[PDB]
């Protein structure tokens, strides 16, 4: 190695052994240190080196002479030697320069009695060279982190990182490696493999088995961790469906059927109600054909709410999409069971939050911010602007008409509404510490939903005066149709929502809005629940609070409104109009919800959008931008246990907790900066080795038990796409690719060695729990392991347990800024060093 170009015989490597080199899989890197036969204690005395006397390889060796010059110029400037060397410069001059630097390095080592300062200096120097930084990884692509590398299936130099799999972009749309001819709403292959960080190979049968193992662990967390059967997760969210092999959907579906019997009846299904985050318009019909074993979002209704109500006044659509642009056309929804089950929302922890922070940062701080890779300080200043925009009548960045969106989400038939934490409480600050201006209106709607919201739905779109309004009516419990005359409970249930999306709305003196309440509501007293005022929304918490504002239906069951009742407003809460009316005389404890039956299911689907699923409410119970806890009583899971009576009062039946995995701290993405739980190194570390952002493993256990004590189900966020920040390095044969895994031609990284962080400790929760339940699962549920998965043609393979993650179980990684030449070669032979 160390050539006849220095003080050899002194600076040569101690022995031909591997305990003398800092190596990665027996290869050397530009940041590799080594143990020389002799060190030079200060610039003074050559002494025999100990086992603790490692020194930078770059102190005494260089890949080319060009690099030695670069090293001398750099290390002179660092150590206070204003001598520069230029284009012309013999080997003898630079070897003399290299000695001198060597001598002063050793002097500073003895002065400070550490090498920490030199680790940094060598690192900083290495990152100045194109072959050891981003410049050899360019050009960047639309990957969230600027690009990715794909690990080669057959690398002769790295056979330990080989795979017979790494089958990419097997989305629901593209599961067979061809576009599914059945699903035509999305032209595209319906997603892409490389999203973030280390991309897990969910096409590998051994990894599939391990994803099921993790699923079983989460669904038995209570039993396994705390020997407590009251502290298990009831259900899952499947994170990033469009970025993983869709085989995982048959695996998770089969498990819910085999383990929880969700296929038998609605009681079983509704005790384990599991959701997808699946953005392709193909994913809902895919999931329906697969057996409604889980439910997807209604993306169409989300876009209809966003563009009809939430957008600025000049970017706002007409209101008719609120009726027609959804999985369910709500003109006249009179069905006992909707065709397809779904959940509905206007915002989520990611959707229409991090997007708005990015808009603010890009507009008023850093125009060159990459994807969602924000700094904490960018976030804090963005939130100064955001929090002011929330309280403004004229909003530049934040949603208009939040209460109008929730009035529709919480009265609509044939979808499970999901309330976002950050619409009731502030997106920043401590958990449940600060209420939004919309908290009252949303709370009032949640309590009214339990008491009044049942039966058939009618929505109408009336052109009035200069613009338009919509009416949305529920007929009341037992009344699917406008002609049903109902019983006593029908009479005191039902609701009328009236909305406009234009602040200039003025009815003519001649205009009337006739709202059919249904044949159970003839000649009846009605009172307001919400009314738009000049400064916001007045909530009425009882019949008596509203005593002065009572109005009546006529003999046909119609409420009638005029200009006196309806006009456009502009205030911090309403841009248009909102009016919500309920019948007078509901008992204090009236509850028109319905439980799931044990009657056998007969249509081949697990989940059914009937009155019992319509009775459920989902709560997404975190924000990305929650402040870190300063003391135990501010930990979210401790606050959840303390406030569990609130959630029951609101009719929350399904509590979607944040992912509970201990966050990585690399800061390479938003998730790793605000530590939400989506960026992790250990899949089984649920606040066990260290608190998560939300508290300790014991705080989580107590939160689950508290929710269960009120009959509320708890959802585990299943995140099989990627992992962050592995502590051990590994050398892989890699190819630069776009997020679809297509090779970027004109790249130095092409069947080339590259140094990834892709090995786990072997001493973490993964090492304890990995594969630990595969024998139990194959014994109880052999059919799970008999199924030939669609993408691979073969069953899951539980014959190997994953105690340590390594490169062979991953597709690739986001580019790490280590360059195409980071692994060192002998210049003459043009081959890599191997020990
Ligand atoms: O491509 C889409 C996307 C990205 C998306 C993907 C993710 O896995 C994620 O964690 C967050 C995202 O927002 O958001 C959309 C919304 C509507 C239609 C298409 C897209
Ligand atoms: Ca992936």
From Swiss-Prot:
Keywords tagged on the record: Dental caries, Glycosyltransferase, Repeat, Secreted, Signal, Transferase
UniProt keyword annotation of Glycoprotein present: no
Single Gene Ontology MF annotation: glucosyltransferase activity
Main location: secreted
GO biological process, one term: glucan biosynthetic process
This protein's GO CC annotations: extracellular region
Effect of residue 187 to R: In strain: MT4239
Outcome, altering residue 262 to T: In strain: MT4239
Subcellular location(s) of the protein: Secreted
Domain of life: Bacteria
Outcome after substituting residue 307 to Y: In strain: MT8148
Catalysed transformations (reactions): [(1->6)-alpha-D-glucosyl](n) + sucrose = [(1->6)-alpha-D-glucosyl](n+1) + D-fructose
Role this protein plays: Production of extracellular glucans, that are thought to play a key role in the development of the dental plaque because of their ability to adhere to smooth surfaces and mediate the aggregation of bacterial cells and food debris.
Similarity comment text for this entry: Belongs to the glycosyl hydrolase 70 family.
Extra remark beyond the main annotation: GTF-I synthesizes water-insoluble glucans (alpha 1,3-linked glucose and some 1,6 linkages), GTF-S synthesizes water-soluble glucans (alpha 1,6-glucose). GTF-SI synthesizes both forms of glucans.
Protein name: Glucosyltransferase-I
Gene (name only): gtfB
């Amino acid at each position: 190695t160390t050539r006849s170009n220095l003080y050899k015989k002194y600076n040569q490597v101690y022995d031909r052994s591997a305990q003398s080199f800092e190596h990665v899989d027996h290869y050397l890197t530009a940041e590799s240190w080594y143990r020389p036969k002799y060190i030079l204690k200060d610039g003074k005395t050559w002494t025999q080196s100990t086992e603790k006397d490692f020194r930078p390889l770059l102190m005494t060796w260089w890949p080319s002479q060009e690099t030695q010059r670069q090293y001398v110029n750099y290390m002179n400037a660092q150590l206070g030697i204003n001598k520069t060397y230029d284009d012309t410069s013999n080997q003898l001059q630079l070897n003399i320069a290299a000695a001198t630097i060597q001598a002063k390095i050793e002097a500073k080592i003895t002065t400070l009695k550490n090498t920490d300062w030199l680790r940094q200096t060598i690192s900083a120097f290495v990152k100045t060279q194109s072959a050891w930084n981003s410049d050899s990884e360019k050009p960047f692509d639309d990957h969230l982190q600027n690009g990715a590398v794909l690990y080669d299936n057959e690398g002769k130099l790295t056979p330990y990182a080989n795979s017979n799999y790494r089958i990419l972009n097997r989305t629901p749309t593209n599961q067979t490696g061809k576009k599914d001819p059945r699903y035509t709403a999305d032209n595209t292959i319906g997603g892409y493999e490389f999203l973030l960080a280390n991309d897990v190979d969910n096409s590998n049968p051994v990894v599939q088995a391990e994803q099921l193992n993790w699923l079983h662990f989460l669904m038995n967390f209570g039993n396994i961790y705390a020997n407590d059967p009251d502290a298990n997760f009831d259900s899952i969210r499947v994170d990033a469906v469009d970025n993983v092999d869709a085989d995982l959907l048959q695996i998770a579906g089969d498990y819910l059927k085999a383990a929880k019997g969700i296929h038998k009846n609605d009681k079983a299904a509704n005790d384990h109600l599991s959701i997808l985050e699946a953005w392709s318009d193909n994913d809902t019909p895919y999931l329906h054909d697969d057996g409604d074993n889980m439910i997807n979002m209604d993306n169409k209704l989300r876009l209809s709410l966003l563009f009809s109500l939430a957008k600025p006044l000049n970017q706002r659509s007409g209101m008719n999409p609120l009726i027609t642009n959804s999985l369910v056309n709500r003109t006249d929804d009179n069905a006992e069971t909707a065709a397809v089950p779904s959940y509905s929302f206007i915002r989520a922890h990611d959707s229409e939050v991090q997007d708005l922070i990015r808009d603010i940062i890009k507009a008023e701080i850093n125009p060159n911010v990459v994807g969602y890779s924000f700094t904490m300080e960018e976030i804090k200043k963005a939130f100064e602007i955001y929090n002011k925009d929330l309280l403004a009548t004229e909003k530049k960045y934040t949603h208009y008409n939040t209460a109008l969106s929730y009035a529709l989400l919480l009265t609509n038939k044939s979808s499970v509404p999901r309330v976002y934490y950050g619409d009731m409480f502030t997106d920043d600050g401590q958990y449940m510490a600060h209420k939004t201006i919309n908290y009252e209106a949303i709370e009032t709607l949640l309590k009214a939903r339990i008491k009044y919201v049942s039966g058939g739905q009618a929505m109408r779109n009336q052109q009035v005066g200069n613009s338009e309004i919509i009416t949305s009516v529920r007929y009341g419990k037992g009344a699917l149709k406008a002609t049903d005359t109902g019983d006593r409970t029908t009479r005191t249930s039902g609701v009328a929502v009236i909305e406009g999306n234009n602040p200039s709305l003025r009815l003519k003196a001649s205009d009337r809005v006739v709202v059919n309440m249904g044949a159970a509501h003839k000649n009846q007293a009605y009172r307001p629940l919400l009314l738009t005022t000049d400064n916001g929304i007045k909530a009425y918490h009882s019949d008596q609070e509203a005593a002065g504002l009572v109005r009546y239906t006529n003999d046909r069951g119609e409420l009638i409104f005029t200009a006196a009742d309806i006009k456009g407003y502009a205030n911090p809460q309403v841009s248009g109009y909102l009016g919500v009316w309920v019948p007078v005389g509901a008992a204090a404890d009236q509850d028109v919800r319905v439980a799931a039956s044990t009657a056998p299911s007969t249509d081949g689907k697990s989940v059914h959008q009937n009155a019992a699923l319509d009775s459920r409410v989902m709560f997404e119970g975190f924000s990305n931008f929650q402040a870190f806890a300063t003391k135990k009583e501010e930990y979210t899971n401790v606050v959840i246990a303390k406030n569990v009576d609130k959630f029951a009062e609101w009719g929350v039946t399904d509590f979607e907790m944040a992912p509970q995995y201990v966050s990585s701290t690399d800061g390479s993405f938003l998730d790793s900066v605000i530590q939400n739980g989506y960026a992790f190194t250990d899949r089984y570390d649920l606040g066990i080795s260290k608190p998560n952002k939300y508290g300790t493993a014991d705080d989580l256990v107590k939160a689950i038990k508290a929710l269960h004590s009120k009959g509320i189900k708890v959802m585990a966020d299943w995140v099989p796409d990627q992992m962050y920040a592995f502590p051990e390095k590994e050398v892989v044969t890699a190819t630069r690719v776009d997020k679809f895994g297509k090779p970027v031609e004109g790249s130095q990284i092409k069947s080339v060695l590259y140094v990834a962080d892709s090995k786990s400790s072997g001493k973490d929760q993964q090492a304890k729990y990995g594969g630990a339940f595969l024998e139990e699962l194959q014994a109880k549920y052999p059919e799970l392991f008999a199924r030939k998965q669609i993408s691979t043609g073969v069953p899951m393979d539980p014959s190997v347990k994953i105690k340590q993650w390594s490169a062979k179980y991953f597709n690739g990684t986001n580019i790490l800024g280590r360059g195409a030449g980071y692994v060192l070669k002998d210049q003459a032979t043009n081959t890599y060093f191997n020990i």
